[PDB]
Amino acid sequence: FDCAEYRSTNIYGYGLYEVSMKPAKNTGIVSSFFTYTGPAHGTQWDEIDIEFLGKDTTKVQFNYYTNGVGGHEKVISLGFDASKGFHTYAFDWQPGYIKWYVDGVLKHTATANIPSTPGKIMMNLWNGTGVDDWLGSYNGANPLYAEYDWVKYTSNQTGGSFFEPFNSYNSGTWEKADGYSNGGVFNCTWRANNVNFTNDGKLKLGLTSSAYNA
Ligand SMILES: [Ca+2]
């Protein structure tokens, strides 16, 4: 299977992160929005997530890692099927807390071990393996798509905030991952061809089958 990941070329720190998106629905996959940095960037592993388990798009899972330590999962019931339309998700990441919101309403707050290292803004869609209890077993359904209408970041004591509407590939600010696979539980290869932009200005990530899957 071929999957998709769009990520920022620069790094960002404390500030408010907002994304308007519509994840994909299907057992075995994840659609997400998150910050990430790690060792392959000579840092501790720090990440804040917003993930939709395709197995149940009426819920959202929040998590974060500080120095490679995770285990802060929090699943919340949205009260709607995220896969049916665009909603705004966000997290405000400050030195002493992380607050997550859904359509402007505070849904969860974390204060233990909040991360500090700026990371890149990443969005991806993939099928997993080896973690059937968490994601459900992937049944090869394809093609599947996750859509993003816009990303906005408001820096604290940082430099530049930005607004990205996804009208087209802005390669000066983002990159499409290509030709490698994260390995581990990610059971697909990232492909730049699977990162596309629709006509009405949405980022569209696709999950498709490869020759050996048919
Ligand atoms: Ca847009």
Curated annotation (Swiss-Prot):
Reactions mediated catalytically: Hydrolysis of (1->4)-beta-D-glucosidic linkages in beta-D-glucans containing (1->3)- and (1->4)-bonds
The EC number of this protein is 3.2.1.73
Query: GO molecular-function annotation terms?
Result: licheninase activity
Keyword annotations for this protein? Disulfide bond, Glycosidase, Hydrolase, Signal
Residues forming the catalytic site:
E47, E51
Q: Could you confirm whether the keyword Nucleotide-binding appears in this record?
A: no
| GO biological process terms held by the UniProt record | carbohydrate metabolic process
**Domain GH16 span(s) in chain numbering:** 1-156
Q: What else is known?
A: Beta-glucanases of Bacillus have a substrate range similar to lichenase of germinating barley.
For this chain, the family text in UniProt reads: Belongs to the glycosyl hydrolase 16 family.
* The protein's name: Beta-glucanase
Show which stretch of the intact protein is covered.
82 to 237 of 237
